[PDB]
């Protein structure tokens, strides 16, 4: 019937205040109850806000729910943000035997300066080439916040197949890391002059290139 | 206090079937509605099924309509999700919830059960060396752990004697159903002529051990 739309990722700082929105595609946000759930990685979700603006026992006072009909959206408000508040938040609503979830918004709690990615690019090993296989390995480390996009190029042209990239993963020093793999045939690799891995981080890209040995 | 403990699940093949279990306790089972929510890896929450407290009304989205069947046993305080004709898409972590129909929200969540659906079977990794490249004065070297199944793989370096600057990357899931990961180490570039770097790959699901020495070029 409708679709709940949240931003993909928002970031703030400690002690500050953030408002997470959940616009509704059609109809009025006030027609049905809105619910907010916090989700941690490897953890069961817990309900944070029920019935538009009710919080269960134990949920901290910082969390609050609201409704704004001017934008037909709902808001989850977090005052005095803590490091523990870095998580994912899903809004929910029900209408005619359907449970509509939002895309969720990954809340980032900025606890350190911004960091540019370290990018290292490995060509296929000689041993791998003799086994009739070829893989490029692009290692991305030491960036904050942890969200990057990767694009590969063969010579100068975009590569549309054979790319597999990991979700960014939190490193030991609370920075994030990711890795990307390009699969080729050995003839593909040797036929082009170069291959390059482009990592976009906060709208600024770092790029490394390798060429057949 | 309310407890929702889920069981079942595991590794399956396309077109096969599974029945998930959620045992309920700490409350009066027959009052509440129940639901199944899943989250596929690297994806948002998705609602799958909702059953009345009497087994009376049952709602399904179109993505799993006619494939899943939700049921409940009053005598055993148990919620079931029969998944049939499974697909690779249905690979997710499945959560059992208690509903409050009066307020349209799930007030209690289970522990979660992981379901994997792939057409792979147990396979050891093909380990290749990642010869060094720069970072100059600091170089990066590693070894590539390709095409294994299932997780996990463990890597140590120089039998655990080498730990400084060792960073083992989380595995990627290939479209072929197999995993690949890399373990890379950063070391002083001076030592390449004198130091031996051997990565010890361990894949207990297939009982495979591979030791590959990483040399310069």
Author numbering:
A (entry chain L): 1 to 9, 11 to 27, 27A, 27B, 28 to 66, 66A, 66B, 67 to 106, ...
B (entry chain H): 1 to 52, 52A, 53 to 82, 82A, 82B, 82C, 83 to 100, 100A, ...
Q: Could you share sentences copied from the article?
A:
Next, we investigated whether amino acid changes in the antibody framework regions during humanization impacted the structural disposition of CDRs. Crystal structures of unliganded 85RF45.1 Fab and unliganded TB31F Fab, solved to 3.15 and 1.5 Å resolutions, respectively, revealed a strikingly similar paratope configuration. The all-atom rmsd between the two unliganded variable domains is 0.88 Å, primarily arising from differences in loop conformations within the framework regions. These structures also revealed how the variable region is optimally configured for binding Pfs48/45 even when unliganded (all-atom rmsd 85RF45.1bound/unbound: 1.52 Å; TB31Fbound/unbound: 1.25 Å). Despite this high structural similarity, amino acid changes during humanization resulted in electrostatic surfaces that are considerably different between the 85RF45.1 and TB31F variable regions, indicating the attainment of antibody resurfacing. In unfolding and aggregation experiments, TB31F Fab was found to have gained in thermostability, with a melting temperature (Tm) of 74.8 °C and an aggregation temperature (Tagg) of 73.0 °C, compared to 63.1 and 63.8 °C for 85RF45.1 Fab, respectively. TB31F Fab shows thermostability throughout a wide pH range, whereas 85RF45.1 Fab is more dependent on pH.
